[PDB]
Amino acid sequence: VKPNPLQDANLCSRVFFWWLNPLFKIGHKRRLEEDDMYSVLPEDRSQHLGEELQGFWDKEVLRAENDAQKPSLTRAIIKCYWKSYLVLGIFTLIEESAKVIQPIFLGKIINYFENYDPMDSVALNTAYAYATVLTFCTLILAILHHLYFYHVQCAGMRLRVAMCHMIYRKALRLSNMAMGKTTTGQIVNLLSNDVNKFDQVTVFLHFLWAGPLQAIAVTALLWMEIGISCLAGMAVLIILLPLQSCFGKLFSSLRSKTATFTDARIRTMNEVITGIRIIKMYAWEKSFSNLITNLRKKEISKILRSSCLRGMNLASFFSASKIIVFVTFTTYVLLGSVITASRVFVAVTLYGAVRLTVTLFFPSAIERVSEAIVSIRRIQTFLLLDEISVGFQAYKNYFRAGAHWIVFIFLILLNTAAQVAYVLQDWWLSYWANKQSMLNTEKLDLNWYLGIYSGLTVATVLFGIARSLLVFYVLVNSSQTLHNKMFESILKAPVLFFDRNPIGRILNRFSKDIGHLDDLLPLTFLDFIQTLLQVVGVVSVAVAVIPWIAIPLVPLGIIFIFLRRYFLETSRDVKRLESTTRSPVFSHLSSSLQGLWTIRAYKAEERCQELFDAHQDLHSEAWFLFLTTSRWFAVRLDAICAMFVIIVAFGSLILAKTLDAGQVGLALSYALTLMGMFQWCVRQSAEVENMMISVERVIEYTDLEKEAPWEYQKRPPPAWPHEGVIIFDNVNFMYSPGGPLVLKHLTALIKSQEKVGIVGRTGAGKSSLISALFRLSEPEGKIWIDKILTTEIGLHDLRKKMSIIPQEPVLFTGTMRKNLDPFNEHTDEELWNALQEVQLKETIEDLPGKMDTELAESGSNFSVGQRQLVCLARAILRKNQILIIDEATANVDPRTDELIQKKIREKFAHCTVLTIAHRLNTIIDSDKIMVLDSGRLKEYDEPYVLL
Numbered sequence: 001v002k003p004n005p006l007q008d009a010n011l012c013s014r015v016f017f018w019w020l021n022p023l024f025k026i027g028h029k030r031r032l033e034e035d036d037m038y039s040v041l042p043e044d045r046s047q048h049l050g051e052e053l054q055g056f057w058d059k060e061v062l063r064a065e066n067d068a069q070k071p072s073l074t075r076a077i078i079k080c081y082w083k084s085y086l087v088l089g090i091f092t093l094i095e096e097s098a099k100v101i102q103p104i105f106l107g108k109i110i111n112y113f114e115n116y117d118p119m120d121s122v123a124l125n126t127a128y129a130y131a132t133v134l135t136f137c138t139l140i141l142a143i144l145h146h147l148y149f150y151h152v153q154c155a156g157m158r159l160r161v162a163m164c165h166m167i168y169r170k171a172l173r174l175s176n177m178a179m180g181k182t183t184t185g186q187i188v189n190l191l192s193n194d195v196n197k198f199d200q201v202t203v204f205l206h207f208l209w210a211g212p213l214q215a216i217a218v219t220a221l222l223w224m225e226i227g228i229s230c231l232a233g234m235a236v237l238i239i240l241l242p243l244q245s246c247f248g249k250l251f252s253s254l255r256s257k258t259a260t261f262t263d264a265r266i267r268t269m270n271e272v273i274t275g276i277r278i279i280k281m282y283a284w285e286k287s288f289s290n291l292i293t294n295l296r297k298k299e300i301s302k303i304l305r306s307s308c309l310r311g312m313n314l315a316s317f318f319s320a321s322k323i324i325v326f327v328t329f330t331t332y333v334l335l336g337s338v339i340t341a342s343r344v345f346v347a348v349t350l351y352g353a354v355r356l357t358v359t360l361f362f363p364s365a366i367e368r369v370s371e372a373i374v375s376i377r378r379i380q381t382f383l384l385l386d387e388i389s390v391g392f393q394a395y396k397n398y399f400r401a402g403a404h405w406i407v408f409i410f411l412i413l414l415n416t417a418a419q420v421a422y423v424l425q426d427w428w429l430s431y432w433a434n435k436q437s438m439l440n441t442e443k444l445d446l447n448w449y450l451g452i453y454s455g456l457t458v459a460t461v462l463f464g465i466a467r468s469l470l471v472f473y474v475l476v477n478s479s480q481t482l483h484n485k486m487f488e489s490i491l492k493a494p495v496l497f498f499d500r501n502p503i504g505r506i507l508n509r510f511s512k513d514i515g516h517l518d519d520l521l522p523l524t525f526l527d528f529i530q531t532l533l534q535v536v537g538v539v540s541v542a543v544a545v546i547p548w549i550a551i552p553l554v555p556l557g558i559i560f561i562f563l564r565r566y567f568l569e570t571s572r573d574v575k576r577l578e579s580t581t582r583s584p585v586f587s588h589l590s591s592s593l594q595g596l597w598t599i600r601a602y603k604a605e606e607r608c609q610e611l612f613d614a615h616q617d618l619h620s621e622a623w624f625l626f627l628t629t630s631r632w633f634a635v636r637l638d639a640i641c642a643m644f645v646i647i648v649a650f651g652s653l654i655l656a657k658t659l660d661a662g663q664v665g666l667a668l669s670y671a672l673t674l675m676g677m678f679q680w681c682v683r684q685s686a687e688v689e690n691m692m693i694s695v696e697r698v699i700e701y702t703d704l705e706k707e708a709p710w711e712y713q714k715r716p717p718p719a720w721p722h723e724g725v726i727i728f729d730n731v732n733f734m735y736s737p738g739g740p741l742v743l744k745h746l747t748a749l750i751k752s753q754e755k756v757g758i759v760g761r762t763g764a765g766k767s768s769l770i771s772a773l774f775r776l777s778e779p780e781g782k783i784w785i786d787k788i789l790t791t792e793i794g795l796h797d798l799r800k801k802m803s804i805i806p807q808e809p810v811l812f813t814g815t816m817r818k819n820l821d822p823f824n825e826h827t828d829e830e831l832w833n834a835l836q837e838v839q840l841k842e843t844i845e846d847l848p849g850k851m852d853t854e855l856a857e858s859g860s861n862f863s864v865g866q867r868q869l870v871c872l873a874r875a876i877l878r879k880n881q882i883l884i885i886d887e888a889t890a891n892v893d894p895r896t897d898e899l900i901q902k903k904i905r906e907k908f909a910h911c912t913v914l915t916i917a918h919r920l921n922t923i924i925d926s927d928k929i930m931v932l933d934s935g936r937l938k939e940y941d942e943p944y945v946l947l
């Protein structure tokens with residue numbers, strides 16, 4: 001078998017994940033296929049995780065049925081995992097208490113600089129001890145966290161597998177009456193969507209009691225430093241809760257109505273791609289073009305508002321750390337107290353540790369718990385029924401299509417000012433403290449120091465909103481300008497491009513690639529850019545105070561570039577492995593429920609359980625590597641993130657004769673916030689480069705094959721088709737320019753007022769002549785028609801002056817007035833005349849509207865009869881000379897074909913009919929008959945010499 005190195009591995013080797021080093025060496029240069037993944041632990045099998053939960057549930061059902069109450073499933077999980085969760089909670093409490101001691105010991109180092117004496121050896125040792133104590137909370141938070149996180153993540157897959165095991169076990173005991181209601185789709189959905197919500201619940205389950213505790217623990221510490229002025233900092237942070245939720249209820253609505261404009265358009269596409277040979281033959285491209293162009297404008301106008309709302313939300317999330325500090329400190333100063341550099345940065349650190357945690361971790365645990373409870377209720381109600389007895393080019397082509405190169409310089413200059421203001425607003429307070437500490441009653445005027453601070457506070461918000469708005473607009477304009485190019489490039493492709501590519505591929509592209517281009521790209525781009533810009537500012541602030549922290553920065557930054565690549569090279573296969581191991585489980589589940597009555601004949605219902613367990617163990621193995629490979633990188637990242645802080649603190653302490661308290665506090669208060677932003681910035685690039693593939697495959701289009709232009713300046717006479725004379729010569733045809741033939745050298749010439757017919761068996765080149773004079777694939781061979789040719793004329797002025805009767809009639813979703821005449825070139829009464837001349841006016845007045853009656857789903861309300869008859873009515877109203885009749889019959893012998901053939905008898909007056917015959921008797925009193933066998937003709941004038 002495949003033993004895993006997770007076991008038989010001592011301590012101090014599982015905190016750094018040292019047992020996963022060899023696997024990387026295999027994934028770096030060999031592309032492991034399926035047999036380089038380790039097995040699962042003996043306590044992670046399906047049969048072990050399912051039987052104990054089944055026993056607990058069977059005991060709970062009896063316990064809750066003997067006494068008159070309802071059986072509950074939520075208790076059967078707490079009766080099992082309570083010990084594990086409360087054991088894990090110890091480290092949660094430890095790491096939550098460790099995040100409060102750091103700002104307490106941060107303020108004790110600045111106090112040493114505030115009272116400095118160059119001849120003193122007792123306080124330096126105390127400062128070193130304080131630094132050593134502070135240098136360990138970071139290590140505790142950075143190193144020992146990734147094992148507890150892996151454990152709390154693994155604590156969910158066990159339940160996820162145990163639920164599916166008993167679900168499948170129950171799915172084989174359903175009666176014939178209970179199965180008549182329950183479909184296979186809802187069962188595979190319950191097993192495919194409702195059980196996947198148990199993976200992210202245990203991660204956010206510990207915030208419901210750690211939020212309010214930490215809030216009070218920090219609020220109690222602010223009173224000892226500043227006083228009442230902390231309330232002015234806590235009164236704003238609460239207001240952010242109802243404001244960010246109410247507007248949420250305003251956003252979701254704007255997301256729903258847009259769907260109404262998104263699906264319908266797609267539906268229209270499903271009717272233009274299926275039937276190109278009819279739309280292109282009738283020259284009806286402009287109608288569908290105008291019908292499609294109108295919906296995209298409304299879709300963009302509805303998307304812009306939601307984009308602006310999301311941009312405003314992000315701008316409010318960016319610069320929310322400046323209002324609280326400004327308010328609390330102007331309140332603290334206006335009361336009559338003196339500002340010092342010992343409490344400012346401590347309060348800043350406390351506020352920054354509180355607000356993010358609260359406003360990002362509290363409103364999500366409730367959603368997670370609600371989804372989990374809904375899923376658990378569904379699964380419980382299900383089990384209670386009775387039983388039986390890329391590259392730089394991909395970015396350049398995507399960015400340069402949005403705006404000119406001036407807007408890019410403008411947005412760069414706009415992005416490179418918000419961070420400068422963000423840093424200067426906090427530097428001004430350090431300058432104020434340093435200027436105040438140098439006094440000996442010669443007080444400081446508040447006007448200047450309070451006006452500069454307000455200006456620096458307002459500029460930050462302004463430059464934070466403008467950048468987001470501009471970025472969102474520029475990135476939406478790109479999709480707006482690419483969708484067009486896609487449409488007018490795909491609309492002009494020849495029939496050879498549609499006869500080989502499936503419709504589902506094109507529809508899937510047009511839907512999901514444009515959805516990705518419109519919805520999630522600008523948000524992720526802006527978030528990544530903001531999180532990346534937030535780190536260079538911290539690095540520059542750290543460097544500008546101590547210029548000697550630029551020497552180790554190069555070795556600390558060189559390692560990351562290689563580490564990211566060395567990780568991705570082997571991490572870019574776990575997703576494929578997981579999907580390939582996950583799909584067969586659903587496949588087997590869906591295919592095993594149909595042939596179920598034969599599994600009851602031979603009473604073997606436990607072998608299928610073992611097969612299901614074996615199928616799920618592969619997905620379990622493929623999922624076990626994901627968490628470990630994801631945690632392998634965070635430890636090495638946090639190592640550098642903590643070494644940076646250690647170096648900063650110690651190098652700043654060992655230079656206590658050059659610097660002062662304000663700037664050491666400033667440099668120390670920023671280094672404690674890098675660990676989260678670095679992780680977020682590293683994470684966002686993954687999704688960016690993952691979703692750029694849709695952009696790249698969108699740009700794959702917009703440059704395809706193209707037929708001849710629609711029209712030239714070679715205008716034919718306005719009365720060109722006055723007489724039907726079609727000559728021929730030895731023409732050879734090939735669909736592809738280098739494939740086989742389907743037809744060979746039809747040489748003839750058709751007279752005017754002549755009813756010519758062709759006799760042949762299906763497959764000998766009989767159904768390809770309509771593709772010749774319609775030039776669907778421009779061949780060699782010069783075809784003269786009425787003093788002009790068929791090659792030096794545009795495609796529209798050649799197919800419009802010709803009529804065609806299709807084999808199988810097609811109808812589009814619209815009005816009866818538009819289906820017979822999209823481009824209005826006639827009056828009102830002529831439509832009634834042409835429709836009664838073909839003898840159908842029952843259905844119209846049997847219906848109310850009878851002129852604007854919309855159809856539905858390809859007009860299934862009608863039959864082949866009136867469909868063929870309305871195609872005949874189109875041929876009637878066309879008012880044309882050349883008529884090509886095709887015959888592919890599946891209809892019945894009664895009055896339909898008699899009526900249509902009599903109408904083609906008397907209605908058509910002396911107009912050059914070219915007919916294709918499938919039954920030898922449909923030709924009645926023909927004038928010219930040709931027989932076309934397996935590659936040429938034996939043609940004669942009259943049928944009297946044939947037989």
Ligand SMILES: CN(Cc1cnc2nc(N)nc(N)c2n1)c1ccc(C(=O)N[C@@H](CCC(=O)O)C(=O)O)cc1
Nearest residue numbers: 360531629630631633634675676677678679680682683
């Ligand atoms: C706690 N937190 C949420 C978090 C952290 N910092 C923030 N910083 C800002 N400015 N805004 C936030 N939304 C924010 N959110 C985090 C922190 C790290 C990762 C993270 O990088 N996770 C990776 C681990 C790293 C990796 O595998 O590459 C993963 O496997 O999913 C996720 C969320």
